[PDB]
């Protein structure tokens, strides 16, 4: 094969194979995508796409093509888009609602902006409402807002998210796991 043969099962091991529904798999990916990227260098667009579909194996129509999956964000979004008939930014509210509940605000934010196509702010607005501790909400709203660009806010949102999870020292939900 030209490029790199997909270890796939290695990747699936990273993701931990499909979760419950197909409809979950999109968002599910955006979580696992970086992890997949660990196994798989996914040095081509081709690769990226073949991984996803190969993960899920029997996914209805999420089976993207080696030309849509150039980024993980586009693919993950599209698989969800597959199952939810696509959205006119109507759905992102609900999309955020589901992941945050399941995985947490940081991840949901991530899918939401991917699903939304890098207009984080809308997804973020819903997300914001999903923060664990008001310190997190406030602080995030403060620093992540203040970023160097609009998308810098997009980029570092989760980092600040995790950051506030750091300073409050949570895993997320205002736990304060960290010693201090």
Q: Measured in whole angstroms, how far is the alpha carbon of residue 66 from the centre of its chain?
A: 20
Contacts of residue 169, Cβ cutoff 8 Å, sequence gap at least 6: 176, 177, 178, 179, 180
CA angle 136, 142, 148 (to 5 degrees): 125
Cα distance between residue 29 and residue 34, in whole Å: 9
Question: Among 30, 41, 34, which residue's Cα sits nearest to residue 6?
Answer: 41
């Amino acid at each position: 094969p030209i490029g790199t043969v997909i270890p796939i099962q290695h990747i699936r091991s990273v993701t931990g194979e499909p979760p419950r529904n197909p409809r979950e798999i999109p968002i599910w990916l955006g979580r696992n995508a970086p992890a997949i990227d660990g196994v798989f260098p996914v040095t081509t667009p081709d690769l990226r796409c073949r991984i996803i579909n190969a993960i899920l194996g029997g996914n209805i129509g999420l089976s993207l093509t080696p030309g849509d999956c150039l980024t993980w964000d586009s693919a993950v979004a599209t698989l969800f888009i597959r199952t939810h008939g696509t959205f006119p930014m109507h759905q992102l509210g609900n999309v955020i609602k589901g992941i945050v509940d399941q995985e947490g605000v940081a991840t949901a934010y991530t899918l939401g902006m991917m699903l939304s196509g890098q207009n984080y702010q809308l997804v973020s607005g819903i997300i914001r409402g999903y923060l664990p501790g008001q310190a997190v909400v406030t602080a995030l709203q403060q620093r992540l807002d203040q970023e160097i660009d609009d998308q810098t806010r997009a980029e570092t949102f989760i980092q600040h998210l995790n950051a506030v999870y750091e300073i409050l020292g949570l895993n997320a939900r205002g736990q304060s796991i960290r010693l201090e």
